[PDB]
Design an enzyme around this catalytic site. Structure first.
Site, PDB file in Angstrom:
ATOM      1  N   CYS A 119       0.813  -1.227   0.000  1.00  0.00           N
ATOM      2  CA  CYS A 119       0.000   0.000   0.000  1.00  0.00           C
ATOM      3  C   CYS A 119       0.838   1.264   0.000  1.00  0.00           C
ATOM      4  O   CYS A 119       0.400   2.272  -0.565  1.00  0.00           O
ATOM      5  CB  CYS A 119      -0.950   0.033   1.227  1.00  0.00           C
TER       6      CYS A 119
HETATM    7  C1  LIG Z   1      -0.904  -3.053   4.867  1.00  0.00           C
HETATM    8  C2  LIG Z   1      -1.842  -1.880   4.820  1.00  0.00           C
HETATM    9  C3  LIG Z   1      -3.119  -2.017   4.345  1.00  0.00           C
HETATM   10  N1  LIG Z   1      -3.999  -0.925   4.291  1.00  0.00           N
HETATM   11  C4  LIG Z   1      -5.378  -1.091   3.775  1.00  0.00           C
HETATM   12  C5  LIG Z   1      -5.636  -0.142   2.514  1.00  0.00           C
HETATM   13  C6  LIG Z   1      -6.788  -0.975   1.869  1.00  0.00           C
HETATM   14  O1  LIG Z   1      -8.034  -0.819   2.579  1.00  0.00           O
HETATM   15  C7  LIG Z   1      -6.313  -2.441   2.095  1.00  0.00           C
HETATM   16  C8  LIG Z   1      -5.564  -3.017   0.779  1.00  0.00           C
HETATM   17  O2  LIG Z   1      -6.630  -3.259  -0.103  1.00  0.00           O
HETATM   18  P1  LIG Z   1      -6.264  -3.094  -1.877  1.00  0.00           P
HETATM   19  O3  LIG Z   1      -4.920  -3.766  -2.027  1.00  0.00           O
HETATM   20  O4  LIG Z   1      -7.478  -3.763  -2.476  1.00  0.00           O
HETATM   21  O5  LIG Z   1      -6.253  -1.568  -2.027  1.00  0.00           O
HETATM   22  O6  LIG Z   1      -5.465  -2.394   3.322  1.00  0.00           O
HETATM   23  C9  LIG Z   1      -3.612   0.382   4.766  1.00  0.00           C
HETATM   24  O7  LIG Z   1      -4.359   1.362   4.768  1.00  0.00           O
HETATM   25  N2  LIG Z   1      -2.294   0.487   5.266  1.00  0.00           N
HETATM   26  C10 LIG Z   1      -1.358  -0.583   5.306  1.00  0.00           C
HETATM   27  O8  LIG Z   1      -0.218  -0.335   5.748  1.00  0.00           O
END
Ligand SMILES: Cc1cn([C@H]2C[C@H](O)[C@@H](COP(=O)(O)O)O2)c(=O)[nH]c1=O
Ligand SMILES: Cc1cn([C@H]2C[C@H](O)[C@@H](COP(=O)(O)O)O2)c(=O)[nH]c1=O
Ligand code: NA
Ligand code: NA
Lengths: 246, 246
Positions: free
Chosen positions: A148
């Site tokens: 992310c």
């Molecule tokens: C590992 C991690 C995940 N996330 C969240 C963002 C998204 O809601 C989800 C990843 O979902 P995506 O890969 O479908 O965008 O995890 C963060 O906000 N910060 C982080 O450090």
């Protein structure tokens, strides 16, 4: 000139407007979200909605200090979210201590510290978290962890060290609070390391600028937005909330 | 909700203010710059200051279509800037056609096209240009080419395809104009490829959002800023400019 950006207060306002508008977009899990596309703001408070949890943050920081890519090495009982995105063997991609302190991701902290100790004015002081092979590595062994955080850049101006954080995707409620605590810890460490190197530098911590492709709230946290929309309180327990989004 | 960002017109204004303030920062080459740290804006015009040059842009696009990492393969006589940053063998890092069309950078275009053809709503449609090993690769064989474009994300909302461009460093005058033409060409191609796949999609091109850690003007172009500050004309020939920054 640092860019005169939105603050955390103004991000709160635009999220409330999206919710009022019913501008919904379908998550990969099938759930509704509200979303700001291409968001950019200064992180002048350590949370957007919700409450702090120093205990958990301190456990995640001890895990980062270990650099382990396995979720079981988090101190104490490992959170359920980390279990659900891990591979068949407990492995993930997103240990940020690995990303910046491991030799296997090309020593991002030490190389950024060397670049800025040698040229305080540089535009190449950056810690690169993600990688091109992520187009294939995100689902290795059945994990579901497309990194992310893309990059974090550090710029020293007027004896203050500023950070520019670039993220593909960030959850407003948990993601932002945990990720902010981490970015502030790294910034303070970098300041202290630069100062112990030369007692004439006298640097101090500056601003953290947050940039996100999709900054979103999951429908399971719509209640916090609605409650803040109605009252100005940035936190309420789910048990106490009265309103539509129960 | 796309973020309601600054436009190109407002970026022009803030650059003019930095120049008026004498807020200078020392470039690695020793030259003064003016700078916006953490800039974010919508690219609603194809240039900021200066003039267009379709001939040169068309030559750079033919070079990108070739995917070559050697500056001599640019059609016609290769520009001097490309010669000065190249290695002892004519090699660089920053061929953006290589970055998105080569198998050696993990097929960024084809994988982003497959991701969005399968899930139009995804937050993982991204083309990753830079890489962690850049902390060491930027000066391979004596080149001086730390990749400037970090990532480009594509988000389809309401049958329009939007792009979010993240850059570490961007020159306002030449860099922005060339880099914009390229990003718009890629966006139009992606739209056309998605539409030929299914004649019910009927997608169209949306907005391009520009995010930069250091967005800067070199002192050799201060004249364009000053002239626009005085007159509103976005271009003047260096021969015709009268003013301090000669
Ligand atoms: C590992 C991690 C995940 N996330 C969240 C963002 C998204 O809601 C989800 C990843 O979902 P995506 O890969 O479908 O965008 O995890 C963060 O906000 N910060 C982080 O450090
Ligand atoms: C290759 C490339 C360079 N540049 C400019 C940005 C900086 O002025 C310079 C790189 O200098 P830096 O690596 O010291 O930031 O080249 C662009 O703006 N766009 C590009 O695509
Ligand atoms: Na544990
Ligand atoms: Na040539």
């Amino acid at each position: 000139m640092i860019s005169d950006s939105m603050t955390v207060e103004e991000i709160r306002l635009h999220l409330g407007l999206a919710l009022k508008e019913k501008d919904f977009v379908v998550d990969k899990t099938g759930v509704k979200t509200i979303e700001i596309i291409g968001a950019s703001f200064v992180a002048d408070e350590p949370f957007i909605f919700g409450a702090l949890n120093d205990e958990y943050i301190q456990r995640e920081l001890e895990w980062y200090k270990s650099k382990s890519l396995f979720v079981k090495d988090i101190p104490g009982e490992t959170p359920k979210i980390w279990q659900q995105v891990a591979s068949s063997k407990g492995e993930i991609n997103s240990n940020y201590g690995w990303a910046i302190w491991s030799e296997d991701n090309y020593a991002q902290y030490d190389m950024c510290l060397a670049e800025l100790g040698q040229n305080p004015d540089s535009r190449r002081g950056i810690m690169i978290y993600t990688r091109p092979s992520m187009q294939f590595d995100y689902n290795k062994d059945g994990m579901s962890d497309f990194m992310c955080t893309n990059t974090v850049q550090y710029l020293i101006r007027d004896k203050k060290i500023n950070a520019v954080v670039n993220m593909r995707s960030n959850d407003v409620v948990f993601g932002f609070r945990n990720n902010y605590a981490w970015q502030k810890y790294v910034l303070d460490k970098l300041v202290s390391d630069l100062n112990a190197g030369d007692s004439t530098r006298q640097y101090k911590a500056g601003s953290i600028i947050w940039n996100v492709g999709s900054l979103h709230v999951y429908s399971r946290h719509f209640y916090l937005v609605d409650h803040w929309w109605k009252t100005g309180e940035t936190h309420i327990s789910k048990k106490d909330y009265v309103g539509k989004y129960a």
